[PDB]
Amino acid sequence: MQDPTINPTSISAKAGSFADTKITLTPNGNTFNGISELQSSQYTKGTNEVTLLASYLNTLPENTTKTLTFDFGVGTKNPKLTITVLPKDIPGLE
């Protein structure tokens, strides 16, 4: 039951097209521990902010639905960043 404001809750891209991306974790009234879904090593947190490394994201298997579950002490509804990793060539019909 906190009021943490961080990156969205879902994204989609090919597994690999996920270049190092630094997210913003607004702690204006909340705290962040880490994203277990991806044993922090997957990313590089920075108190109030956290960036993910294309290494982890790119590592993710086929069309996997990765969820950056930022543990803000309120996992109940904590800001989950459901990132879609699709290394397989299929989507992208611009």
Which of 54, 55, 46 has its CA nearest to residue 23?
46
Asked if 2 contacts 72 with a C-beta cutoff of 8 angstroms, the reply is yes
Asked if 75 contacts 1 with a C-beta cutoff of 8 angstroms, the reply is no
Q: How many residues does the chain have?
A: 94
Residue 41 amino acid letter: S
Q: What is residue 31's three-state secondary structure?
A: coil
Helix, strand, coil percentages (3-state) for the chain, rounded to 5, are: 15, 35, 50
> CB atoms < 10 A from the CB of 36, how many?
12
Handedness of CA 87, 83, 35, 17 (dihedral sign): positive
With residue 54 as reference, give the H or E element that holds it.
Answer: helix 54-59
To the question of domain 1-94 being in CATH 2.60.40.10, the answer is yes
